[PDB]
Design a protein around this ligand. Structure first.
Ligand code: FES
Length: 98
């Protein structure tokens, strides 16, 4: 399956739509399609690539930085997240983390 991923940059007021395979991380697909997104470690262990789910689900089982409450709040590390449905996500949310 291939899912539609809508990327929202609130501060910029931008909206970009990408198509993501069920077996590719969102960050990788975004880059391939022309959208550079923030990142550092690329391994699920930092907060640089943090995003926030608006709608849809992901599989980020490979992540290790976010605690259970943060996940519950909708936080996602884009570098190791697979979409599991069409998704709407706000990018550049690193600052929201404490
Ligand atoms: S870039 Fe570090 S967790 Fe994604």
């Amino acid at each position: 399956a291939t899912f539609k991923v809508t990327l929202i940059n609130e501060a910029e007021g931008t909206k970009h739509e990408i198509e993501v395979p069920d077996d590719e991380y969102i960050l990788d697909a975004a880059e391939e399609q022309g959208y550079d997104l923030p990142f550092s470690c690329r391994a699920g262990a930092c907060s640089t690539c943090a995003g926030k789910l608006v709608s849809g689900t992901v599989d980020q089982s490979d992540q290790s930085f976010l605690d259970k409450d943060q996940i519950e709040a909708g936080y996602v590390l884009t570098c190791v997240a697979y979409p599991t449905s069409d998704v709407v996500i706000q990018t550049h949310k690193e600052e929201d983390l404490y």
